[PDB]
Structure 1
Amino acid sequence: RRKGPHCERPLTQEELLREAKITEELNLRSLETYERLEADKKKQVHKKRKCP
């Protein structure tokens, strides 16, 4: 009977959250396009030579 728990930060705003995720859509599309283009322009599946 000395200690006790705590909790805070009860905030979630419906419309502001919708806006926030509609914005995160930008980051998601940027990540997808960046990954796709980087893969296509760097991998170009192939091999290299040996190091003897």
Structure 2
Amino acid sequence: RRKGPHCERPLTQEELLREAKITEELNLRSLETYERLEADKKKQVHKKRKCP
């Protein structure tokens, strides 16, 4: 009785939707440019000093 088929939302791909998804992937390439550029590693300072 406790069935869970998940046949709902039977989504399918189409040619008009193809170019839209290509468009968001072109934007994803543009975003990839932010991965193609680079910044620095942020190194760290020395340990605290004793004083007895």
TM-score where L is the length of structure 2: 0.43
SS where residue 34 of structure 2 aligns? helix
| Root-mean-square deviation over aligned CA pairs | 5.6
The total of aligned residue pairs comes to 52
**Unpaired runs of 5+ in structure 1?**
none
| Percent identical residues | 100
Q: More displaced, 17-26 or 37-46?
A: 37-46
SS where residue 41 of structure 1 aligns? coil
Deviation at 1:22, TM superposition (A): 1.3
Deviation at 1:7, TM superposition (A): 2.9
TM-score where L is the length of structure 1: 0.43
**Unpaired runs of 5+ in structure 2?**
none
**For the structure 1 residues 3 and 21, does the alpha-carbon distance in structure 2 shift closer, same or farther, using more than 3 Å as the test?**
closer
More helix by share: 1
